[PDB]
Symmetry: C4
Subunit: 237 residues, 4 copies
């Protein structure tokens, strides 16, 4: 189960890094005088097509991996992950269609993303039924992060071309990935032996501070990525 | 009671399909060069008048059907449906008046719609008092859907001419209708014998996934309708 | 206590009627070709000054009436009404200052109004501590109405010159007044003898429908007032 | 602990006064005809640099003072204050960087501020675990104030150059400082002996009215500051 928690963390980390890099590069191209390094739009179209294809492929891979099998109910918990992966694949297909046919509005993709996020949150609001207070609290924090990311995505859809909103969305995605890794490390330690008790208000207090530190680290990572891309553009110019 | 649950499902399904078709046709007419096929505005006015008349008629029919009868309280539950139908009839009358007199703003109708939705949600927040956890959970999901549809309608009223928002509202209406049908099928099976226990967390988990699948199906239906209307316009041209 | 509940109902009813009439007259003046009947702005300034003076006077009168008296705590419940009246008086003073000095923005008054409403809601969220479920439910409905009115006022402040928003705010004020009268009639019947039991889910269900009917009646009253003002303008022209 | 509560109150009071003065001066400069008294922009740049430096210094001082020390958990409560001070220092550093490099958007600083506020609220939602109902209620009021201030800051970030929004944010900051002082005076009286019982609904009712009075006092202080700055500008001119 540790791998099952860790894989989405890597996926979200990669997606957030790619989106942040794309947004910074687009802003730099807008600031750019001409098509010397980034003005070409065919490169952007190819990057969008590749992004959609990779999202669809990752969704399919996650769906296949989660489903162990290639009038009753069994292993019902995996169907939630199945549905989440299906929604992300629908988002990828919608992005591919939008960037393939010019008639469809560009922002539609963003809308789809928001929808997917909301769906995920809804599922995570009911995925846990029993279990201990620590697990419940951690899953509620994950739900809060997903809901905030969905709200930010919807607001970005409403307001066209907001670089700060895109950076905030990327930071939230990175925070979600880091928190998924934290969930994995806490619930299923790789050391083999349990380390954190499931009933400790001290653990809850420490987890709150850890979540805040993760958010701060994601903000710092976004800033460092912006600085690195600026340095690379300056060196290229 | 199964018929009483099923009839609003059909009404909402028809209304959502009609609204989606109208929005797609309006967008196509805007993209159209001239009045060759859809540029005429008298057709739109006639369609709006017919839509208002049909909404008023359906509200009256539902009110009459719900009321079995043509200092105490009896059959108090039916008065809630009476009030909901009355509010929908008020929305229809307001739409007719707005499209009859040019002085009134067009968006007023939208506002009225939002109000009606909110009222419905409020009623459904108190309609159920006793009953089992499964029924309570299903009615709470219905309340959530109605509240989200009302918020989307209000936002559409605030922001003029958003095709994506109109499509989202139509998809939400279709989801509401499908969930009404699901409520009917679960609470009062047509088979005569009970099938689903009223106390099962497994049933709750399955219902969450069923709701997500219904939302996905509605999105797919909206996409297919858009494709079909595009095909029809291309064939006509 | 029945008079203490009824007086704010009359105040809110009068204020809502005056605001609705003012908004409709302003819209008609905007539609008007010239200063034949309503184009004069000195009339609007005089009306605003009179409105501010009347609001301040009503706030002072309510404060004086509520306070029976012209290291411990006694009659602490009246201080809440004192604070609400003080906030409304501050709103009136702010409106007078804004319409007296041209430097201050016009929308500031609206903002103040919103603030006052929010404060009222907050107080009504803690005014009731004990008491029965019926009283708690009715006060919670009043809190909901006040919160919705405050949100509508804030949104109107954000978006300049929205006639529909002003009409919605007026309808909400009228609904608040009617519900205050309902609270008075239910809690302290004028007949002398108690009529409604304080513990009845049937009473709760009836009160929900009564609230919906009050909202519908307020909407109808707003529509009738608009029609009457249109008739009067047409007759004058 | 009384000093630990009181110091942030003084910090917030000073920051709110400075921000209100800056906003009023900026509005007066905009109304000003030329650079006679305030048109110079180098003064604004120097003031912004000084504000950032002072914010960073105060954050560092608070962090050092809170940390008594220059596989277990001890004094975990202080890490929350450490994190809050770290976030405020990050806000100050971001403001300094934004006013140092022209490429970065100006509103970014505002965004950062909002983020910090939200983080603080989150921490204060979990800082208290045990304790009595009075302390819980007071901390919940503080959480509400912080959340409202964060929402106002985010809305100000969304809508450029709103003087009323800036004044509202300053008033909320002053209210937060005054309520911090109230918390200090109630929880840890300077008289040495306890005065307020920790379990009294009368105390809760009095605290609600005290909070409303604090809000009113902050509004009056903002108005007086505006009047004083107007008088000073008129005298200088
Ligand atoms: C159109 C949207 C419907 C298709 C989306 C799939 C719905 C979920 C189907 C899974 C299911 O078991 O259905 C349960 C229900 C009940 O049928 P059932 O036969 O599957 O119930 C099984 C009973 N037990 C569990 C005891 C074996 O089916 C539905 O209600 C879905 C049809 C509603 C479509 C609305 C009309 C258009
Ligand atoms: C589809 C329907 C929409 C998505 C459905 C998911 C709802 C997500 C709700 C988020 C909170 C649930 C998680 C939780 O309770 O645990 C958090 C933990 C657990 O709290 P606890 O006290 O219950 O722990 C014991 O801490 C919190 O409660 C954080 C407070 C947040 C509550 C309000 C957050 C709403 C969003 C705030 C951002 C501002 C925007 C608001 C709109 C404008
Ligand atoms: C104007 C808005 C009022 C008209 C909308 C209908 C209100 C609901 C009337 C139904 C009702 O029973 O009223 C109960 C109450 C109480 O009167 P009641 O006589 O009907 O109470 C009956 C008592 N039992 C149940 C024991 C038989 O009436 C009202 O309060 C409505 C009048 C308020 C109007 C405000 C003044 C303007
Ligand atoms: C008129 C007044 C307005 C309309 C009144 C109806 C209020 C509707 C409340 C919706 C939630 C009620 C249903 C419910 O609790 O069961 C859901 C079920 C039952 O949960 P459960 O945990 O209680 O089940 C046991 O699951 C959820 O709680 C879903 C989480 C949603 C909670 C927050 C949703 C608010 C809207 C989110 C969209 C973002 C926009 C926010 C504003 C910007
Ligand atoms: C500036 C805003 C402060 C003025 C607004 C009035 C505050 C409410 C005063 C009422 C009160 O009793 O104060 C209680 C508290 C405690 O003082 P106290 O002497 O009144 O407490 C009385 C104790 N018993 C009830 C047992 C008799 O006073 C304050 O904390 C208000 C001063 C804070 C101002 C912040 C510094 C600037
Ligand atoms: C200053 C701070 C702000 C003002 C503080 C007052 C908060 C007001 C909260 C409103 C609900 C409280 C009253 C109540 O619970 O009883 C209602 C009654 C009692 O419910 P009950 O189930 O508890 O009754 C037993 O019914 C409801 O709960 C109605 C559902 C509404 C809940 C959510 C309403 C929020 C606003 C919805 C409009 C959409 C805008 C949202 C933002 C965008
Ligand atoms: C990148 C973001 C990670 C750095 C931010 C600091 C995380 C908090 C570290 C404090 C901690 O104790 O870690 C606990 C956990 C567990 O490791 P641990 O060894 O510290 O656990 C200690 C166990 N007891 C308490 C019994 C002594 O560490 C992490 O999970 C953080 C690493 C996740 C980074 C994600 C991969 C990129
Ligand atoms: C990061 C995540 C976001 C920040 C997380 C903190 C959440 C803050 C929640 C505020 C309420 C919590 C404090 C509390 O419950 O005690 C208050 C006290 C305690 O209440 P009590 O009844 O529980 O006391 C016993 O009183 C209230 O409940 C006030 C009612 C307010 C509830 C709703 C406020 C939401 C904001 C309203 C402004 C309108 C904007 C809404 C969006 C548009």
């Amino acid at each position: 189960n540790f791998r099952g928690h860790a894989l989405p963390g890597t996926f979200f980390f990669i997606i957030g890094l790619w989106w942040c890099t794309k947004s910074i590069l687009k802003y730099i191209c807008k600031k750019q005088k001409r098509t010397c390094y980034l003005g070409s739009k065919t490169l952007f179209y190819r990057l969008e097509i590749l992004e959609g294809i990779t999202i669809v492929g990752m969704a399919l891979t996650g769906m296949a991996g989660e489903q162990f099998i290639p009038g009753h109910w069994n292993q019902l918990l995996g169907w939630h992950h199945f549905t989440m992966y299906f929604f992300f694949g629908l988002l990828g297909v919608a992005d591919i269609l939008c960037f393939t046919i010019s008639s469809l509005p560009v922002s539609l993709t963003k809308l789809m993303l928001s929808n997917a996020l909301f769906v995920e949150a809804f599922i995570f609001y009911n995925h846990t039924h029993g279990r201990e207070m620590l697990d419940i609290f951690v899953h509620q924090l994950l739900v809060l992060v997903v809901f905030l990311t969905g709200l930010v995505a919807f607001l970005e859809f409403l307001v066209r071309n907001n670089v700060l909103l895109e950076l905030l969305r990327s930071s939230l995605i990175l925070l979600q990935g880091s928190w998924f890794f934290q969930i994995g490390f806490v619930l299923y330690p790789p050391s083999g032996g349990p380390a954190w008790d499931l009933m400790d208000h001290e653990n809850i207090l420490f987890l709150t501070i850890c979540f805040c530190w993760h958010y701060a680290v994601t903000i710092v990572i976004v800033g460092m990525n912006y600085a690195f891309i600026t340095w690379l553009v300056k060196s290229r110019l």
